[PDB]
Symmetry: C2
Subunit: 247 residues, 2 copies
C-alpha cells in the first residue's frame, strides 16, 4: 500500500525521540533519535520515501476554545500539509476528536518536578494554597490540555494561574532557576533531566496515556503503520531503541 | 462516518476470565449472567453509544490462535471472523498473528508475560532453564496469547518450551496443575496477579517479559471502531479503567 509512496511527516525536536540539527546536514539526515530510527525502519520495510515537515509555529498542538482552531503539528495534519505525525504524540480526547492515532509505542504519565531537595509540596494542587513556588506548563503541549480538560477544575486553575512556558528549553531553564514546579511528561523529563541531581519529583505520576503517531481520519496507511508498529513492540525493537537513545 | 451505534444490537465475544469477566452458569439469564471489569465497560459503552448487546462464547472455549497446518483460526477470533460476533469484549492481548486477521480497539491496560512456579528446593531464574533440567514440568494454555508469543519469538528455544511443555486446556486446568507442584506456568501478569493472590507457595520465575496490551477485538473495516476507540480513550483519560481495576482485582493477601 505504501510501496513507492512519499510521506510527508510532521515532527519537531523532542529529545530523545527526535533531534534536529539546524546546520551541517541536509534533508532527512538533519534528523536523528528514537522516532527517526522507527521511521527509517518503516521506510525500509514498507518501501516509502519521506521527508519531515515542522510546523511554522513550532508547537505540538492544542485546540483553542475561543477560536475552535488547532495549531502546531495537529493543525498541519488537518490542513493536509503532512500525512502522518511522527513524534512522541500523546493520546488525549481533544486530539482524538480531530485525528486518529496509530498503535501506541510507549506508555507515559504526567510528572511534576522541582529544583531543591526537601520540597514541602506533596501534590501539585497544593501549589494553589501557597506562594513560595511558582509553576507552569508549556503552551499547546499535551499536559496543558490534560489539565484543562480534567474533571476537577482546580487543574484548570493550575494552568490558568501558572507561568506560560514557550518550549522545553524555556521550561527547563525556569526549573533550574529554582522555586518553580514544572509539570510535563515522565519520559521527556527522565531524559533531559538525567544529570540534574538537585531536581526532584513532586507527588507521584498521574494520568495514564500513550505515545503514538498521528494519522488523519480515513488515512489509507493506518492499517499498515499499526501492524508494523505492533511488530516493532512485539519483537523488542522499541525497547532496544529506548535503551539506545535514553540517557 | 455516517454509521453510528444507536439502535444497533451487538454480539460480543467473551468468556470467563477473572477479574475481567465472570460467567454464572445457573440462576441467571442473558446479560445478567455476566459481571466483571469488562462487563462494566460494556454497560457504560452501551448506555453512552445507544446499542443493545448480548455475549456469545465460542463453543471451543478458546481465546484464539492460528493453526499453521490448516491456516484456520479458532476461539473468539474465529467467531469474529465468521461474523458470529461484532467485537471481542475481554482482555484480548495484542499480537502480530491476530493483527494479521483482525483489528484492535484502543488499548485499556498494559500487560506482560509472567512465569510462576511452585516447588521447594532448587528453583529457576529464567524460563529457558527449563529445557536443561527435569525437576520441573511446565506449560502454557493452548490457543491463548502466551503460547502464540513464545511460538513466534525469534529465539526458537521459546518454541521448544511450548512444544515440550504439558498441554493445558484452560486457566482452571493450568492453575490446578500449578497447585499440584513442581510446575512452571507461563501466562499473563494481570491474570496471574488476580487469580494467585492467595497462593503463598507460588513464586516468580524471573521478571515479566514481552510488553503488550489488552484491547477489544474488532473485525477489519468495522464501522464501529472509531466510536469504540474514542470512548475507550475517554475511559482511560477519565480514570475509569483504573477505578474498575481497583473495584474488581483482588486486594490484600493472606501471604
Ligand atoms: Mg500501553
Amino acid at each position: 500500500n505504501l510501496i513507492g509512496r512519499h510521506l510527508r511527516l510532521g515532527s519537531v525536536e523532542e529529545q530523545p525521540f527526535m533531534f534536529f540539527a539546524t546546520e551541517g546536514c541536509e534533508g532527512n539526515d538533519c534528523w536523528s533519535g528514537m522516532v527517526n530510527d522507527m521511521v527509517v525502519k518503516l521506510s525500509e520495510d514498507l518501501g516509502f520515501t519521506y521527508e519531515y515537515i515542522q510546523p511554522d509555529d513550532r508547537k505540538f498542538g492544542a485546540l483553542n476554545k475561543t477560536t475552535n482552531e488547532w495549531n502546531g503539528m495537529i493543525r498541519d495534519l488537518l490542513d493536509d500539509k503532512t500525512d502522518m505525525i511522527a513524534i512522541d504524540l500523546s493520546t488525549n480526547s481533544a486530539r482524538k476528536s480531530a485525528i486518529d492515532y496509530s498503535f501506541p509505542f510507549m506508555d507515559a504519565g504526567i510528572k511534576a518536578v522541582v529544583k531543591g531537595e526537601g520540597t514541602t509540596l506533596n501534590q501539585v494542587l497544593e501549589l494553589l494554597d501557597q506562594d513560595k513556588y511558582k509553576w507552569g506548563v508549556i503552551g499547546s503541549r499535551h499536559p496543558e490540555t490534560l489539565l484543562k480538560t480534567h474533571r476537577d477544575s482546580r487543574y484548570s486553575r493550575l494552568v490558568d494561574e501558572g507561568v506560560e512556558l514557550k518550549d522545553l528549553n524555556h521550561a527547563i531553564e525556569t526549573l533550574r532557576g529554582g522555586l518553580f514546579v514544572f509539570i510535563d511528561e515522565g519520559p521527556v523529563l527522565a531524559h533531559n533531566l538525567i544529570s540534574d541531581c538537585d531536581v526532584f519529583s513532586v507527588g507521584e505520576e498521574f494520568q495514564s496515556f500513550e505515545y503514538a503517531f498521528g494519522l488523519p481520519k480515513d488515512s489509507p496507511y493506518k492499517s499498515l503503520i499499526d501492524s508494523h508498529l505492533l511488530k516493532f513492540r512485539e519483537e523488542g525493537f522499541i525497547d532496544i531503541l529506548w535503551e539506545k537513545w535514553s540517557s
